[PDB]
Amino acid sequence: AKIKARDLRGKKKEELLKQLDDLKVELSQLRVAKVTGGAASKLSKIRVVRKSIARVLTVINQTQKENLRKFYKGKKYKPLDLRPKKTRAMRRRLNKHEESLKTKKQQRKERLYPLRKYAVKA
Amino acid sequence: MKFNPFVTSDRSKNRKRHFNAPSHIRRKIMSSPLSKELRQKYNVRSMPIRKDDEVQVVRGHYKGQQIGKVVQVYRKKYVIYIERVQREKANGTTVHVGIHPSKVVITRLKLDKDRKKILERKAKSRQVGKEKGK
Amino acid sequence: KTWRRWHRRVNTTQKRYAICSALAASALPALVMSKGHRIEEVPELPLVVEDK
Amino acid sequence: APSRNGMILKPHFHKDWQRRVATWFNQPARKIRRRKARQARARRIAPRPASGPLRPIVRCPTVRYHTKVRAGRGFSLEELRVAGIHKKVARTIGISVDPRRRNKSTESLQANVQRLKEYRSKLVLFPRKPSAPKKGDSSAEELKLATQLTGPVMPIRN
Amino acid sequence: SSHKTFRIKRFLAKKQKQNRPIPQWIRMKTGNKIRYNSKRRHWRRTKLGL
Amino acid sequence: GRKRPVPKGATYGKPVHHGVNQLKFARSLQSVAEERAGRHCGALRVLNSYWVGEDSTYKFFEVILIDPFHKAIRRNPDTQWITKPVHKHREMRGLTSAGRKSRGLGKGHKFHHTIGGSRRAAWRRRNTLQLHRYR
Amino acid sequence: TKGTSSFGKRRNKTHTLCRRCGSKAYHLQKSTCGKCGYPAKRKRKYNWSAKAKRRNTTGTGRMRHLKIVYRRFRHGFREGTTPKPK
Amino acid sequence: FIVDVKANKHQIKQAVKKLYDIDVAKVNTLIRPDGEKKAYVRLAPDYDALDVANKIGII
RNA sequence: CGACUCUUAGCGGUGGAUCACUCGGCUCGUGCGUCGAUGAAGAACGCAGCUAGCUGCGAGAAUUAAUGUGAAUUGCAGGACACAUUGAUCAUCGACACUUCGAACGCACUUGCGGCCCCGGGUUCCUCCCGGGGCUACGCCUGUCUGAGCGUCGCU
RNA sequence: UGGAGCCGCCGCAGGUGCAGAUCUUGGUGGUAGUAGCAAAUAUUCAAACGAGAACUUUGAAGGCCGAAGUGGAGAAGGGUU
RNA sequence: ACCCACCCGACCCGUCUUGAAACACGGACCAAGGAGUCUAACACGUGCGCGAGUCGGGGGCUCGCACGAAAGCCGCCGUGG
RNA sequence: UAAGGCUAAAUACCGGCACGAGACCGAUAGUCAACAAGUACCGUAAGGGAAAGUUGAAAAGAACUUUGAAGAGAGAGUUCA
RNA sequence: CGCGACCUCAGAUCAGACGUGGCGACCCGCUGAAUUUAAGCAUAUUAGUCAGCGGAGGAGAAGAAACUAACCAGGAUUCCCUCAGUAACGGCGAGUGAACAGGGAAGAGCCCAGCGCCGAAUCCCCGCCCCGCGGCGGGGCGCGGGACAUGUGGCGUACGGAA
Ligand SMILES: [Mg+2]
Ligand SMILES: [Mg+2]
Ligand SMILES: [Mg+2]
Ligand SMILES: [Mg+2]
Ligand SMILES: [Mg+2]
Ligand SMILES: [Mg+2]
Ligand SMILES: [Mg+2]
Ligand SMILES: [Mg+2]
Ligand SMILES: [Mg+2]
Ligand SMILES: [Mg+2]
Ligand SMILES: [Mg+2]
Ligand SMILES: [Mg+2]
Ligand SMILES: [Mg+2]
Ligand SMILES: [Mg+2]
Ligand SMILES: [Mg+2]
Ligand SMILES: [Mg+2]
Ligand SMILES: [Mg+2]
Ligand SMILES: [Mg+2]
Ligand SMILES: [Mg+2]
Ligand SMILES: [Mg+2]
Ligand SMILES: [Mg+2]
Ligand SMILES: [Mg+2]
Ligand SMILES: [Mg+2]
Ligand SMILES: [Mg+2]
Ligand SMILES: [Mg+2]
Ligand SMILES: [Mg+2]
Ligand SMILES: [Mg+2]
Ligand SMILES: [Mg+2]
Ligand SMILES: [Mg+2]
Ligand SMILES: [Mg+2]
Ligand SMILES: [Mg+2]
Ligand SMILES: [Mg+2]
Ligand SMILES: [Mg+2]
Ligand SMILES: [Mg+2]
Ligand SMILES: [Mg+2]
Ligand SMILES: [Mg+2]
Ligand SMILES: [Mg+2]
Ligand SMILES: [Mg+2]
Ligand SMILES: [Mg+2]
Ligand SMILES: [Zn+2]
C-alpha cells in the first residue's frame, strides 16, 4: 500500500506521472465519499493519498532540478533558481579571489620586509 | 555541585523543559529500572520503557509482586498502562490506571535489534568507566 | 533603579584586621563552640594536619 | 532655599541625565574579557614578547613632569640610523618606530641608541625556515628559549 | 449591500466561517483550557471591521 | 542661504527663534550637490566633487561617481575599498571631502567639540553620568 | 440636531481596507491610507507612537522567510549539499 | 459541483469533459457566501445526468 | 413567648480576601551579531477525517524529501505498518516546494484591460476561439545595435 | 477548619504598618419588592398543539393602516439577518 | 471576654482654622492596593581603620566563577585626589 | 604642511538570535499581556485597549433507583476528602 | 550630396550587472522645539535635547598632525581614571563649562594626484581548450572587439624620492 521515496527515485518519468495521476484519481473518489457519508475507512485514506501525491511530486521536482543543475554545472550564466542563495548582502561580498589580490607594491613589501619570529632575553 | 555554565539548575526552566518536552526526549525521561536479575545479566541500570515489556509496579496502591505486560505508553501524560493495573469506573467499564514508569521495574525486556544495541552500548560505557576508575 | 549604590567598598587594612580577628577566634574553643561547631572530641583546636 | 551657612553649590542635574546614566555592572566581565583577549594574543605571537614591541625612553613635557621619564611611542629615525637598523626592518623585529619625533638633545639620542643596541644583543631571531641561513641565531639559543617575556620588554626605571 | 465587490464578499465569507462554536470533542483533549469560543459575533450587536 | 520653512513668519516660540530670513544651512552647497548626485544614482557610489562655475542664481559642480560592481573597479585592489558596504552613501552620512567640512573635525585646540568621533559623540561622553560600582 | 438625529445620516464611508497594511484606514477620496501611507513607497511609522510602532514590527507576523534565515545562519548558511546518506 | 474559485466556465467545461468523458452544454457558475465557487453544469441531451451521477458515486 | 428590631454565637449562603503554589515577568551578565527584486518585513485568503481560536504550514498547504532517533500518535475514530524493516514518532533541516497583495514590476486596482514569443486542444499557421508556458517597472553602470545635429573637420 | 510548608535568636536589607486622599480596583447594603414596564382608538369567542396558553397557530367576530399605507419593490448601510 | 440591667459621664471622625458637634468641606459599607524614595553634592554629629599622611579607583596579576560577576595580591601603593 | 584617499584594536548596544544568573515581583504585583493578548471591545481614522491562573495523586468527573416537562432534588456510589 | 572621422546627444523587452523597501538598541548626516529654571520675563536655561527627515554596520564614526607644547620637551584615533565642577562663558544671575600634560585599555600603519622615467609596458568584454567550479577563478590559445594618450599600469609621496 505505502508509496515511499526510496523506489520512486530510480523510476522513469512517464511512470511517475502515471502514478501521480492514479493517486489524484483515488483522491477525487475519496473526496466524493467524504460528501456522501462514505466510511471512516475511506476518510483516513484521504490524508494518506494526499501525502503520497506530495511524495511523488516532490521526487519529480527533485529529479527535474537535479538534471537542470547537471546541465548548467560548467556554464557561466545559469538560472537564478540554480544560483546559490545565501543572503542578499553576502551575494555582494567580494569574490574570494578579488579579496585575495595584493597590489604589486604590497607584494614587494611582504617579500622584502616580512614579519620575523623572534624572542628576547638571550 | 554543577559547574558547566550552560546548564540551568533553575526550577522554572527545568520544569518548562520537562512539561514541554518532545516525544523523543520524553522517551528518555520515561525510562525505568531493570530488575536485579537483568541488571546482573546486561550490566545496565535502566532502560526506556516500551509498549510490551513485562513489568512490576513497585510503589502505590497497585504495588505488588505480579508481573504485568505493558499495554501502552502515553508520553503526553508521562505514564504507562499495565495489563491488570485497572480500576472499575462507575458504570462497570474498566479503565487502565496510569503508573509513572519510574515506579515500575522491568522484569522481561522486549528485545528487538535496536534495543539489543542500546543495551550493548550502555554496558560498554559502564565497563569503560569501571576500567578508568581502576 | 539599576544605579542604586549596590556595591560597597571597604578599607584594605580594615579587611585585613577583620580577617586576623576571624583567624584569631578560630582558636579559642569557647568561641568555636558558641558558633555551634561540635568540636567536643577534637584533639587540638588550631587543628593542623599532615600534608598527604 | 538656603538655610544658614553652607556651600552655595551648583549641581549639574538639569539636563535629562537619567536617560544617559552609564552603570558599571560590566566591569568584571569586561576585565575578564580583556584578560582572555590578552592571553589569546600571547598564545598567537608565540615566543614574541606579549608586551608588544620595544619602546623608547622619553622625557615628559612641562616643568611639572620634566624630571620623570616614560616609555615613548616609538624610536626616532635618527636613533635607528645610528644603531644601524633599517627603518622598515625595525618594525619586523619588534622595534617601535615613529617618524614624528624630532631629536633635540644628544643626551636623549645616545641613551635611546644604547637601548636599541641592548635589544639587538639580547634578542633571538628565529630563522625563516627551520633550515638556518645568516642572521638567525644558533639552535642552542632557541631550544633553551622560545620563551615569552612577561611584562614590558626592557622596562624603564626613572 | 447587494452590490458587493469580490474583496468584500471574500471578507464577509471568512467572518461567517469563523463564527461557528467549538466542537465538543475539543473539550476532552488532554491539556484543554477552552470551554466556549468567546470570539463569537452576533450581527445585530458588534459590527464587523467595516 | 536657507529661509526657515514656516508659514508666513509664525515661528511660534520665544523671540530668540523668530528668525526666518537671514539664516544659513549647516552643510555646504558643494555637499548638497554630492548628496543629490548620490540620491539619483543609488547604484553608484560618490567619491568626491569639484566646482565648475557659478551664476548669481546657481552653482555648478562635478561629482565623481564609481560603480561598486564593474569588474575594473572590483578587481583593482587600490579601488576595491569603495566596493565594501560601509562606503554605501558616503555623501549621505557626511564623509565626502565637502561633507566632512561641515562636521568640523580637525586636530588641535580649534576643535574640542568633535573630540570623540563627531560633534554628537563628544556631547554624549560629556553628559553621561559614569556611575561606578564602588563610587 | 447636532447629536442623535444627525447620527441618523451616517450612510456613507470614508475609509476602506488598505491593501498594504490590511487596516480599514484607506481614505477613498484622498486615496492614501493613514496607517501605512499605502501609495507612498515607505511604510509610515512615527517615533511618537511607540505602542503603534510595536503593534507591527518584524516579530509581529509570520516572519516566514526571516524565521528560516535565523536557522540557516545558525548552522552556517550552507547550500547545495546533503548529510551523508545510508 | 464545487469548483476552485480561480476557474473560468471554459476551464470547468474542459475539466468535466476530461474527468467524466462527458460533454457539456453550458456552465453556469456562482460563488457561495462561504468562498466556494459552485458550478451548475448542464449536460448535453444525448447523455443522462442520473447515469453519470451513479458512475461518479453520488445519488 | 407572640411580629418586627437590635446584639452575640452555631450552621448555611453571597463574595473571592488571605495563605500556599508558578511552563510569566522584571533586572544584570555572556556569546554571536544574520533581512530584501533569487521578491523582505507586514497584510490577505486558504489548508485537518471530525478543528472555531491560538499555533503550524502554502494548492506537495497541521506539511514533502533527506539525516539522526527507534515505537508510537492519542479527544474519538480509523488505519497503517511485519517496529529482524530507510522504520512509527519526535528532533534536526543541507534537498525540494513556497496561493494573492506588499519596495511590488505590463497597465490598472474593478480583481478590470492588455501587448509580444512558444506549446496542447482549435487549426491542419486560418486566423479566430479556448487552455498552458515565458517575457513585457523605474532608475543607473559597462558594453551592443540603430540613429540625430547650419556641433568640429576630412575626402569627394 | 485546612492540607505543605514554617518559625525563634544574632546580624544585614527594604517597594515595611492606613480610616480618610470627591483616593485606585473588586465586592455588598439601605433606599426597594420602591420608581417604574401610560405616545400613536381594540379587543372577544371557540378549537388545535402542548407538562403548561391572557401572548403560539387555525377558524369565527369586532377594529385600525386607509394607496403622501402599518401595502408591493429598490438605493446606501447591514452581512447570513 | 458573650448578652442584659441600672446610676453617673458622654455631641462625629478626619481636616484647614484665633475658633468645629457645626447650618464648614471629605466619609453608604467591606476587602486588597495606596504617599518622604533613590542618585549626586555639601555640611555637622557619631562609629571603625590608618595617621603627616591617607586613599582606591582605574588598571593589572591570581580561574572553567558552583558559591565569584566575589575574595586575594600589585616598585602599579600612588599617576592622581 | 592644509584645500585627495584607505586602515584592524581597546569602545557602544532597552532591536535580533541563543544562553546564564538574581538579597526583584509572585496573579489589583511582575511586562499591556503567567491564560486562544496587542486578543475581545471601542473609535470614520490617527489611535485606544481590558478582564481572565489553581477539582483531584488519579477522572476514579457521580452507574443505578426514585420525584419532577425540566432545571432541580432524595438515596446510591467514587475519593483520605 | 554623398561617403568617412570624431564631438555631443537620443532610442532599445539590446547583453550582462547593480539601486529601490524593512529593521532601527547602538552609529553617521541634517533639522530642531516648548513645557521647565530664573520664584515675573524677553538674553540665558531646558538643548543641539524630544518630535521631524535622511544613511549605515556588526559595530559605526574617528585616525596617521597645517597636533600639543614652550619642557632637559612630547608624537595618529578611540576608551577609562584624572585634570575639574577647573580655565572660560553668563540679565557675570539662574546656571553652564572644556582642553593640554600624567597614569592606564589598545596599539598599525599606509596609498594617490603631482614632478619624472619606462614602444600603454594597463584595463574590460568576447570566442576555443585543460584544470577548478554552492564565495565565477587559474593557465593556455585567437589579426576577435572595445576602454585608454582629455593619460591606464610599474617605480615613487614629504619618514624625503629618483637616477
Ligand atoms: Mg602605485
Ligand atoms: Mg599594553
Ligand atoms: Mg444596530
Ligand atoms: Mg530662550
Ligand atoms: Mg572652510
Ligand atoms: Mg497539594
Ligand atoms: Mg522588595
Ligand atoms: Mg481602607
Ligand atoms: Mg408599583
Ligand atoms: Mg384615523
Ligand atoms: Mg417585502
Ligand atoms: Mg416597505
Ligand atoms: Mg472636628
Ligand atoms: Mg451653625
Ligand atoms: Mg475646601
Ligand atoms: Mg459626602
Ligand atoms: Mg493595605
Ligand atoms: Mg565625621
Ligand atoms: Mg575614513
Ligand atoms: Mg489575576
Ligand atoms: Mg485576579
Ligand atoms: Mg496583571
Ligand atoms: Mg489572590
Ligand atoms: Mg481574580
Ligand atoms: Mg479559587
Ligand atoms: Mg485563588
Ligand atoms: Mg479536606
Ligand atoms: Mg535602506
Ligand atoms: Mg518662571
Ligand atoms: Mg514659580
Ligand atoms: Mg509665567
Ligand atoms: Mg545650548
Ligand atoms: Mg529624534
Ligand atoms: Mg570605519
Ligand atoms: Mg589627512
Ligand atoms: Mg591627546
Ligand atoms: Mg579637585
Ligand atoms: Mg549648554
Ligand atoms: Mg601617473
Ligand atoms: Zn494602509
Side-chain angles (χ1 to χ4, degrees):
Chain A
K2 293 186 173 290
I3 286 173
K4 308 170 185 301
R6 259 213 162 279
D7 56 29
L8 297 191
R9 264 66 184 75
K11 295 213 284 193
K12 200 149 280 172
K13 211 274 296 311
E14 68 89 18
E15 178 64 285
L16 284 175
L17 296 183
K18 173 175 281 99
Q19 192 154 58
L20 181 52
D21 289 345
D22 201 32
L23 295 175
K24 294 262 197 66
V25 166
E26 183 152 32
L27 211 208
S28 195
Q29 294 160 279
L30 296 163
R31 275 166 198 282
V32 171
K34 185 165 66 168
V35 172
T36 59
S41 67
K42 291 179 194 163
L43 309 198
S44 68
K45 281 225 72 163
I46 196 164
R47 202 170 106 123
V48 170
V49 171
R50 282 156 84 271
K51 300 323 194 184
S52 52
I53 283 163
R55 263 184 283 282
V56 168
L57 276 159
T58 292
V59 163
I60 291 165
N61 298 318
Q62 300 259 7
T63 54
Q64 162 262 96
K65 201 157 211 164
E66 257 62 68
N67 279 335
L68 263 149
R69 62 178 85 239
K70 189 145 282 157
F71 174 72
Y72 290 108
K73 178 251 200 77
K75 294 190 178 70
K76 190 257 174 73
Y77 298 111
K78 56 185 77 178
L80 291 147
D81 286 327
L82 310 172
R83 292 184 182 189
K85 187 199 176 84
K86 324 205 83 171
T87 12
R88 177 51 127 66
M90 201 172 289
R91 301 181 306 199
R92 292 132 173 69
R93 278 180 303 157
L94 279 159
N95 205 265
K96 104 91 72 254
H97 219 145
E98 290 179 359
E99 145 46 15
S100 198
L101 308 180
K102 309 273 88 163
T103 17
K104 193 79 80 200
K105 199 158 178 139
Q106 194 175 8
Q107 297 177 248
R108 195 192 213 275
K109 274 194 186 187
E110 289 156 298
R111 194 162 301 160
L112 300 176
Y113 310 108
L115 273 161
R116 275 285 250 286
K117 178 184 172 90
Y118 64 58
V120 321
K121 199 146 270 61
Chain B
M1 286 304 305
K2 94 97 196 308
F3 300 69
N4 177 314
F6 299 87
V7 218
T8 328
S9 188
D10 186 295
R11 263 198 90 72
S12 49
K13 292 205 213 124
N14 294 14
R15 285 169 52 72
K16 195 174 190 297
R17 211 69 47 75
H18 188 266
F19 301 119
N20 299 9
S23 182
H24 84 279
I25 298 181
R26 291 182 152 172
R27 185 177 159 284
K28 215 154 274 72
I29 295 167
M30 289 185 69
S31 62
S32 48
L34 275 30
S35 70
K36 275 187 282 285
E37 189 184 316
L38 294 193
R39 232 157 74 164
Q40 195 79 62
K41 191 165 93 168
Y42 295 114
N43 206 17
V44 177
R45 198 62 143 71
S46 54
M47 278 302 294
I49 202 159
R50 191 259 193 67
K51 190 152 194 170
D52 35 28
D53 289 20
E54 280 81 2
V55 136
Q56 291 202 140
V57 177
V58 190
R59 340 230 92 176
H61 182 275
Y62 298 85
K63 169 219 295 293
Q65 222 78 286
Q66 295 88 328
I67 298 158
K69 193 179 79 212
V70 175
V71 171
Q72 59 104 297
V73 184
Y74 219 129
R75 305 212 271 207
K76 196 179 205 72
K77 295 164 142 68
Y78 278 90
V79 90
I80 53 154
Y81 293 175
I82 295 162
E83 195 75 74
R84 297 170 299 280
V85 175
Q86 59 190 41
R87 91 183 277 5
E88 197 205 66
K89 219 201 300 194
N91 60 279
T93 46
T94 44
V95 178
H96 277 88
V97 173
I99 300 295
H100 189 268
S102 65
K103 315 321 219 84
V104 134
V105 56
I106 299 161
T107 61
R108 210 204 311 172
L109 292 158
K110 203 250 178 180
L111 296 166
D112 312 61
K113 186 165 281 183
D114 296 302
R115 245 235 181 78
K116 280 167 199 290
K117 87 148 284 187
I118 287 158
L119 273 79
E120 290 166 36
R121 303 252 294 105
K122 289 184 170 202
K124 196 187 75 175
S125 71
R126 180 70 135 286
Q127 97 81 15
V128 168
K130 186 162 64 262
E131 285 291 316
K132 197 265 163 172
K134 189 167 184 288
Chain C
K1 262 49 159 61
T2 46
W3 62 83
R4 191 197 308 253
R5 188 169 73 102
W6 303 102
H7 293 61
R8 230 44 155 254
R9 53 157 336 290
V10 188
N11 291 352
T12 309
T13 55
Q14 294 193 268
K15 314 217 231 77
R16 285 163 172 177
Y17 205 138
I19 229 163
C20 290
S21 309
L23 284 160
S26 66
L28 283 49
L31 298 186
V32 171
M33 280 197 69
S34 290
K35 228 280 207 163
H37 294 278
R38 190 138 312 288
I39 198 256
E40 296 270 34
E41 284 285 309
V42 137
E44 190 164 47
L45 210 220
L47 172 56
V48 200
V49 180
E50 221 93 323
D51 318 72
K52 326 312 136 179
Chain D
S3 292
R4 56 146 83 92
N5 214 354
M7 294 191 171
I8 206 82
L9 79 187
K10 341 271 277 197
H12 293 62
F13 300 120
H14 301 249
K15 300 179 165 192
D16 194 351
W17 65 270
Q18 317 203 240
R19 226 188 70 203
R20 303 174 297 278
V21 164
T23 53
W24 281 68
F25 311 126
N26 284 292
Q27 99 168 249
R30 189 140 83 196
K31 275 155 139 281
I32 291 154
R33 197 205 283 99
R34 267 102 154 285
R35 132 179 219 64
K36 281 192 194 305
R38 208 169 300 115
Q39 288 167 324
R41 200 206 184 200
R43 287 184 293 92
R44 187 218 280 98
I45 70 206
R48 282 80 106 73
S51 161
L54 177 67
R55 292 206 135 95
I57 293 169
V58 141
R59 277 211 186 286
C60 321
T62 82
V63 39
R64 160 116 89 145
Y65 292 112
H66 218 237
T67 61
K68 305 301 175 69
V69 165
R70 323 184 288 137
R73 199 265 201 291
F75 285 85
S76 116
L77 296 163
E78 259 285 327
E79 332 194 278
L80 289 166
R81 191 183 297 201
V82 171
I85 308 170
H86 187 272
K87 71 191 202 77
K88 297 196 178 191
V89 178
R91 290 270 47 263
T92 63
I93 345 165
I95 302 168
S96 290
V97 180
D98 84 65
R100 292 185 289 235
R101 254 180 55 186
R102 79 194 80 267
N103 217 239
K104 301 197 83 185
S105 64
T106 326
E107 280 60 32
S108 77
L109 183 41
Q110 253 64 325
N112 268 222
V113 165
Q114 252 59 1
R115 255 215 162 199
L116 294 171
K117 295 286 187 182
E118 184 61 59
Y119 187 59
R120 287 229 94 266
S121 81
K122 63 159 80 292
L123 171 137
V124 174
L125 186 44
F126 284 65
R128 292 257 50 206
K129 291 259 66 63
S131 305
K134 273 66 173 67
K135 302 180 68 56
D137 293 35
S138 56
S139 59
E141 291 205 315
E142 207 89 311
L143 192 74
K144 65 129 67 176
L145 80 177
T147 197
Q148 288 213 326
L149 206 83
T150 316
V153 51
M154 297 208 311
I156 301 176
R157 155 156 19 253
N158 187 37
Chain E
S1 184
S2 218
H3 269 313
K4 298 160 219 296
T5 69
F6 181 75
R7 229 87 109 269
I8 292 296
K9 195 182 198 183
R10 201 160 90 271
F11 174 65
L12 294 187
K14 191 205 199 70
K15 264 76 264 285
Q16 227 199 59
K17 287 192 283 193
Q18 295 208 41
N19 234 15
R20 61 153 277 102
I22 285 167
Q24 291 193 64
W25 57 267
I26 292 295
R27 310 222 308 104
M28 257 58 80
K29 289 219 208 199
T30 299
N32 207 241
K33 309 184 192 177
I34 317 182
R35 20 277 185 90
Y36 69 106
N37 187 23
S38 82
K39 279 199 188 185
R40 295 223 54 179
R41 165 186 65 77
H42 182 255
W43 65 276
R44 191 63 153 288
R45 16 76 83 111
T46 313
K47 283 285 194 173
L48 268 279
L50 277 178
Chain F
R2 178 171 191 285
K3 95 109 74 168
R4 191 181 281 244
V6 277
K8 298 89 180 295
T11 328
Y12 314 106
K14 286 149 162 153
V16 178
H17 303 131
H18 276 24
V20 358
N21 284 358
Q22 288 177 0
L23 46 95
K24 289 91 199 195
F25 184 46
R27 280 214 321 282
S28 57
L29 302 183
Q30 185 185 336
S31 67
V32 164
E34 275 158 312
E35 191 254 32
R36 285 173 177 177
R39 227 112 251 282
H40 200 279
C41 316
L44 300 192
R45 211 143 284 188
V46 176
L47 182 67
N48 220 329
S49 75
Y50 63 85
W51 178 99
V52 306
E54 70 217 356
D55 168 27
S56 59
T57 66
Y58 301 120
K59 282 196 196 278
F60 295 82
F61 290 94
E62 258 268 298
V63 179
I64 299 153
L65 289 148
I66 301 185
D67 253 43
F69 56 94
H70 181 273
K71 294 293 202 160
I73 283 64
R74 281 259 187 151
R75 299 188 205 165
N76 176 285
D78 270 324
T79 61
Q80 76 185 329
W81 68 262
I82 320 145
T83 67
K84 300 205 164 187
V86 188
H87 304 269
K88 280 189 206 175
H89 287 281
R90 289 153 49 80
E91 73 293 357
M92 307 304 323
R93 288 121 43 78
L95 305 162
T96 58
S97 190
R100 198 197 221 72
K101 295 191 189 186
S102 67
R103 296 167 77 227
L105 32 82
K107 297 204 189 78
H109 78 267
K110 318 203 91 184
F111 296 95
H112 301 335
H113 30 259
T114 79
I115 203 153
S118 54
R119 203 156 282 237
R120 204 64 50 129
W123 187 93
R124 194 207 334 291
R125 171 167 37 75
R126 280 149 170 158
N127 312 337
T128 36
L129 261 194
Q130 252 71 270
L131 281 175
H132 296 201
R133 249 143 94 266
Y134 291 100
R135 311 274 175 76
Chain G
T1 19
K2 62 169 90 267
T4 289
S5 77
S6 304
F7 287 90
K9 66 228 295 184
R10 289 175 143 71
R11 165 171 44 270
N12 47 299
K13 327 186 86 178
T14 24
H15 293 108
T16 194
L17 293 156
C18 172
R19 34 94 63 77
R20 188 137 75 72
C21 65
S23 75
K24 192 275 221 85
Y26 188 80
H27 203 213
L28 306 220
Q29 283 169 252
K30 285 196 295 168
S31 72
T32 74
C33 176
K35 183 61 163 61
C36 79
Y38 167 60
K41 276 185 255 284
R42 299 153 182 284
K43 173 190 186 275
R44 183 180 95 121
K45 69 203 282 277
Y46 287 107
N47 219 318
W48 40 259
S49 46
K51 190 184 285 104
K53 223 151 63 184
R54 93 163 87 108
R55 285 199 193 73
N56 52 351
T57 55
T58 51
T60 325
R62 280 150 106 329
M63 293 219 294
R64 69 210 277 199
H65 170 65
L66 196 42
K67 82 214 302 279
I68 79 166
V69 173
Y70 298 138
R71 147 161 74 76
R72 232 204 323 284
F73 164 88
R74 197 189 329 289
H75 196 31
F77 278 130
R78 88 187 35 63
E79 277 292 336
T81 56
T82 57
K84 186 184 77 181
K86 303 147 91 293
Chain H
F1 292 116
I2 297 307
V3 168
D4 193 358
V5 72
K6 298 158 183 71
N8 316 130
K9 288 168 183 167
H10 298 304
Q11 302 199 78
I12 295 154
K13 191 159 159 65
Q14 264 69 304
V16 162
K17 198 156 283 157
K18 203 88 171 186
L19 301 201
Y20 312 127
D21 298 7
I22 213 157
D23 44 48
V24 175
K26 65 169 194 177
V27 180
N28 217 327
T29 59
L30 64 76
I31 285 167
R32 289 219 258 80
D34 270 306
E36 291 81 65
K37 170 163 281 168
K38 195 194 296 203
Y40 303 102
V41 183
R42 183 68 188 281
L43 298 166
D46 63 331
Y47 294 153
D48 250 308
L50 228 73
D51 296 38
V52 60
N54 294 353
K55 219 71 126 289
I56 69 171
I58 73 179
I59 191 71

